[PDB]
Symmetry: D2
Subunit: 368 residues, 4 copies
């Protein structure tokens, strides 16, 4: 039942992603000394100017200059011409820091969860490739293989699909668009060649690459001093690339900068968890689990499972499977998913869903 | 086939929405003197401090101080204690301004369109009520009826649904959560009373209000000097409240601050247009039109119509109806939808979809 | 030998003085926990926006938000309409803090010292009155006597003089100009009346007030919301009001924000000390002591005493008196003057010279 | 009657001087299109971040981004590593611009004027050399002779003097301290050599250089990426280097950023004018003219001439000479000195007094 789809992703150098990372880095820095630290911060950046804003109630001694500059260094901004230098950039900290199981969900909410068997990660091929494409470039950048490669990048992958008496089977990569920052001493012809052979063909399964697949490598020409400006980078502005690439559903809640007590993060992770668990347990090929919460109440206020006719069990057979295998209460979620651990910075880029190294990405058994 | 859903919206005073408005105000200010002005700007705010960033190639004389301060005044920030005063706030302008039909879509893209017959607006009841709830408060604020009401507000509406051999029929409003900024001389009991009688009951159809409907008016108690602070307002961070309240699909593209040449805005409007047109023409009760574009190419690179079995015509009968009634090429879209007109500021709040006063909200005939 | 002179001063609310105070407050906050803390910081402010910049090598735990906001509170900025509110203003801290007798003067330098017997403070009448005028207003503000009085103020005092076979004898106050911020509910007529009777006549000696003395109270009309904006306040920009009101000599070195190891502060204090000591010891009626230092060298590189023929001893009789009573080496200065003590904030306003509560203002014995 | 003196100066790259220049550049940009433009602005800078503040009532179309970036380019900040790049730095404009002979002096004031015959410029040798030293470095920088030389520099010159039955005769240059920013590929030994032979010996008269003259070239070693940072550049903070190097007297008024209607600038220029005219006319070898103004009154409120016994005419013989040759009323000053002309930027560095290319530096005839 043919149709096409496109998804995108950005590198660690993208202005918005730098803020997402810095904000989560401050979250990690607090969890390490106070696992109950209440973190609510965000970052704004603009050409060698980083602004740390936020309200965080914690009891840990943190050097914000150090956590911000270290994060910029990690990203790869050490030289001047790159558009950012952790040693010279302005780090304005306007941060306000205080000191002092059946909890109860804060703020009326509605979290979504999604999973599909088109890839081993249980994530849309389009967004998976988009992420992996950026990931590979960072590897070649940090390894030395492609030393002209710079931190800021953007990726777009559009794959042609076809339904299947249930749902969504990828057929081939229609076109790929990739833009990456770079050093001066490297020709546009050499860049485009490396992007096709060393990054694209090294991550995209042969089955999907074609003789017609369209490539748009460095479409706009040169992207040299295009360091983090992009007319002001911000936290929580890359909401769709952090989730499913526009495949599931999104209420609008941002992750980065918020601790484990905010249902926007925790519950969203929990919902992905159950979704991935369901398909992994063969109970369906594609699911859209919807979990709703009521302010004050701990136990979820109605969970809805949305298979697209890919399940044999039948919604409201699968719901009981979820109700007998999962306890989606806020407090239990953080305990079961080990959400007090400082893993948030690595979650701040290349997507929150998909990577198995995250608790919520480990499928639960599901006793049926 | 019961399930519940929740959606939210924010007032003109919300930090993020102030930026969305200011950014679009600068867009309007340019279109009025140069309908071909290339606008790409964004705003950041934080307690009497507004930062205007951006790259805009236009040929019109604009007083950015005036357009920013006027927008803050319009919103209702004239006094000190409100958290913003257009006469005293810091307006730092770091804006860069230059001077000098079958076009071709910029940037690979995938826009979504959505419509449902559950309301006359052809928008989800949950998001429509959420918006109207905030709209009414602004009216009572500007009229004088409720003089304690301040610009910043947040609304959440959760409605209980039930499918129907096709899709989505609202049954009743399960719960409503509304928070609004206010003046000191007004009791929490008087506020909650006015919110239920004068705002909620004056906008929510009797059919949906119940004896069990849950109300959470000013849950967190007071919200006096709150105003636009919420440690850092930003543009393009309220992506879901600007669209369908998490009902359709979203690729992640922001509207505010971008001119009509960006497919993220134009094509998204066009997609809503056709969706609304389809249901209005009786061709379906609920649609999710998906329009894809290829960088360089003008004609859309595959459009997909997604009815949920609510159509009698049958997808790929409806596609020809769309292909015979619509010309979704970027240039044609702006011409047909009159996208060079300065209506963007009013689009910057209370949602981009739903209100009939916008070109894309006027259903096309559809000759079938 | 008639001639006239004018001097000025500013209140604790003046933008520049707020920065001078905040910078010194950060200096005090460090000295209290580490008397060897190396402080080199400065502040910038602009309508509810304070920027703390600087490089300080110390080993003490300081809450910069607390020290900045407390200083703003002390000044009298607690309400919104005043142009500053310590509870709501933006405190952006871009501060960089590290951790780890015959010293030797840093940086080639030339410090000046001045004293005259026209007042008991050994300071020019014009600047003394200018300071005292602002001091009295702060008293009436903090006492409650004049509750309409606000933090920001400016004072100018011009006195008619006459030489005397030596130098400088004040005759009368020619004119006085005073401007002070205020609350809305207070008439211009009532303000001007209070300024003449309660502030001017309560500080200016009867001997100097005349029937012709010119008064310019609130010349520009109303100064209400004129809170700290004055188009950006800065540290070290009020160099002359911090010293002699344009009577001695000034090399251009700023005090506020610099610790006791900077000769610009210490040596300047030392020079005032000896000047005050000389006149107090009857060795002259007016002196301009000039102390020069050589980078690397501890012992001063030539000190020059400049009496205006008011001494009977004779320059190079008085020099030996200074060389036998004073050891102006940097390290000795800080030890003798107790410069590791946190008294710098109170030195940040109303003048560094004149007030007896400061070590350098206590005349040394002088054995001759 | 031996004594020594020291003075200093800074290059066009010094943070404070960049602001003084940018502020005056905005003043020039307005005078060119509206000679009656009311300018009152100031600048603040900090590592690739320039903040333009101010209130200017004018009727001219100015591109502040252009005038700020052009000024930074002129100074020599075009590359990244230099600590500033006009193409990449953040120019935040928070400027507010409106549109719409016997005047009368604004603000009680007291301006000073100074001149001495020790140099043809009628300025202290110490400050003249200090300025010329920095000037030469800029020449060699812009010519190409010393291509490692960067914009930011600081100079100090200390000369040994001796009175002369009147006053002040320079004997020799005791020591010279010069620090200048530089490129990486240049040894400390090569820099110090070039500074002595190519800059110092090329500007300092043979008569003053000795075999004992002390040189401190690049004392603190390297100064590479230093540039305009020095944690926070400001306007009006280099008050003494803009005048007489601590030789005359200074009331504290800043020049840069203020138009010709502010007596702080105009009257100060006028006072220098008469001082230079007096010594040039042989009426004295050293003068300190003191001009006082009364708010509201046009005609100066008492002018005092202070020769140090270097005149044969006798104070109050010279006063009549001044009263018969000069009309120091504010309006007349601007007319006679052509103060509506855009020459203020070149006045913003290397000193306001001394250079003959300025109106106030052209001696008036003086008919006696
Ligand atoms: N997703 C979220 N859900 C709930 N609270 C949040 C979230 N993100 C941040 N916060 C909270 O909001 C505060 C920061 O924003 P702010 O609105 O300025 O506080 P205030 O209204 O008191 O000024 C933090 O103290 C933090 O605990
Ligand atoms: N009057 C002064 N005399 C000497 N050093 C000073 C003075 N005021 C501040 N400083 C020093 O200069 C430093 C702050 O300015 P900065 O020029 O940015 O350092 P850098 O050149 O390493 O970037 C501080 O670390 C402080 O010790
Ligand atoms: C007490 O509730 C306060 C604030 C609110 N939800 C906002 O800043 O958006
Ligand atoms: C190593 O000396 C450095 C810097 C210099 N005096 C300045 O910033 O002004
Ligand atoms: K966020
Ligand atoms: K977004
Ligand atoms: K200073
Ligand atoms: K000054
Ligand atoms: Mg709540
Ligand atoms: Mg808010
Ligand atoms: Mg929201
Ligand atoms: Mg030194
Ligand atoms: Mg410097
Ligand atoms: Mg200096």
């Amino acid at each position: 039942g043919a149709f096409m789809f496109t998804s995108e992703s950005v590198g660690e150098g993208h202005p918005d992603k730098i803020c997402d990372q810095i904000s989560d880095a401050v979250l990690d820095a607090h969890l390490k000394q106070d696992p109950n630290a209440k973190v609510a911060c965000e970052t704004v950046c603009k050409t060698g100017m980083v602004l740390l804003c936020g309200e965080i109630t914690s009891m840990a001694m943190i050097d914000y200059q150090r956590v911000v500059r270290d994060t910029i260094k990690h990203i790869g901004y050490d030289d001047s011409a790159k558009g950012f230098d952790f040693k010279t950039c302005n780090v304005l900290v306007a941060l306000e820091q205080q000191s002092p199981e059946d909890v109860g969900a804060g703020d009326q909410g509605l979290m979504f969860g999604y999973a599909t068997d088109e890839t081993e990660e249980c994530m849309p091929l389009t967004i998976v490739l988009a992420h992996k494409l950026n990931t590979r470039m960072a590897d070649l950048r940090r390894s030395g293989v492609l030393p002209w490669l710079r931190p800021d990048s953007k990726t777009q992958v559009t794959v042609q699909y076809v339904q299947d008496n249930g749902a969504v089977i990828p057929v081939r990569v229609h076109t790929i668009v990739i833009s990456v920052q770079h050093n001066e001493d490297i020709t546009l012809e050499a860049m485009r060649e490396a992007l096709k052979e060393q990054v694209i063909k090294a991550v995209v399964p042969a089955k999907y690459l074609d003789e017609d697949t369209i490539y748009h490598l460095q479409p706009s020409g040169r992207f040299v001093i295009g360091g983090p400006q992009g007319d002001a980078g911000v936290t929580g502005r890359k909401i769709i690339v952090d989730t499913y690439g526009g495949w599931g559903a999104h209420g609008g809640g941002a992750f980065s900068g918020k601790d484990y007590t905010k249902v926007d993060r925790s519950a969203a992770y929990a919902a992905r968890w159950v979704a991935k668990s369901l398909v992994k347990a063969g109970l369906c090929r594609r699911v859209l689990v919807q979990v709703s919460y009521a302010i004050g109440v701990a136990e979820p206020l109605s969970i809805s499972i949305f298979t697209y006719g890919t399940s044999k069990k039948t919604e409201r057979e699968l719901l009981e499977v979820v109700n007998k295998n999962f306890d989606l209460r806020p407090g239990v979620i953080v305990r079961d998913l080990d959400l007090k651990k400082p893993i948030y910075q690595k979650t701040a880029c290349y997507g929150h869903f998909g990577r198995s190294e995250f608790p919520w990405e480990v499928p639960k058994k599901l006793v049926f």
